[PDB]
Structure formats: structure tokens, C-alpha cells
Amino acid sequence: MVLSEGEWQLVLHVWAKVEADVAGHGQDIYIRLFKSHPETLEKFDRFKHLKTEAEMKASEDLKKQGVRVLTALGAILKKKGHHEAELKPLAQSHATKHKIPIKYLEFISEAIIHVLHSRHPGNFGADAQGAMNKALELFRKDIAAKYKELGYQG
């Protein structure tokens, strides 16, 4: 699905708030993901031992990974759909090495939306959330197509 420029601006206006503290947002998103869908934590060899939210919050390595995820996603969002180059390395590692199903990308998308909804009411009202969902649906659609090209059912 193709986003309008207005939709992209709603996406980028809340992403600007994430960027005040990408590390803190990444921690909240990972905690939400692992709490809501615990099976996703099992895909992380370095983090699957974490037992509680306190341990997740105290993990410097998890914090760094959160920053990587959100910075990679931010670069994709800033391309406003013209993210072919950015999806190549990401799809390859996630399909072949990490083996992350599309359903798990749906789960992290849900966690992103949940955290933006709680933190950023000023920039994440209904229309803004709809635009972000559209952007994440586009991301997942295009990643799923790349997964298939790479040989992974997803």
C-alpha cells in the first residue's frame, strides 16, 4: 500500500520524538515485545537468558541492540517507501541467520505502536497511528517479498 506525503509526515513527526532518546524508546519496545510475546526472546542467543523486566532494563547489550533496531527502522521510514537498498541486508540477516517469521515482525510492530501510543499522545493520535501502521505494513509487505526471494517462507 502506498502512503501519501501527509501520512509520511505523521510518521516522521513522531519519529522525531523517538529520536530525543532512541535508547530509552528501544528499551521500552523490547520490554513490551518480550512481555507480550515471550517466544520472541528465544530468537536472541545473547539475550534469551534475561528473566525479568529489571534485567532487560539493566542490559547494556540489549539497550545497544534497541538503538540498532530503531535507527535501522528510522532510516527505512525516512526513505518514505523507497527503501529497497535498506531492506536487502536486513531481510538477508533476518531470513537466513536469525530466522524471524513475519508474525514476529508483526509482534514488534505492535510493540512499537504500543510504546508510541503511551509515550507520545501529542504526536500519536488516531490518524498518526494509522499512518504508522500503514508504514509498518508496507515495511512488512516488502520484507516478506524479499524473504521469499531469499528462500524463506517467513
Ligand code: HEM
Ligand atoms: C522493525 C523490525 C526490525 C528491525 C529494523 C531489526 C533490525 C536489526 C538490526 C539492524 C540488527 C543488527 C544487524 C543484523 O543482524 O541485521 C538486528 C539483529 C537481530 N535481530 Fe532484528 N530487527 C527487527 C526485528 C526483529 C525481530 C522481531 C526479531 C526477533 C523476534 C529480531 C531478531 C534479531 C536478532 C536475534 C538479531 C541479532 C542480535 C544480536 O546482535 O545479538 N529482529 N536486527
Ligand SMILES: [O-]
Ligand atoms: O532486532
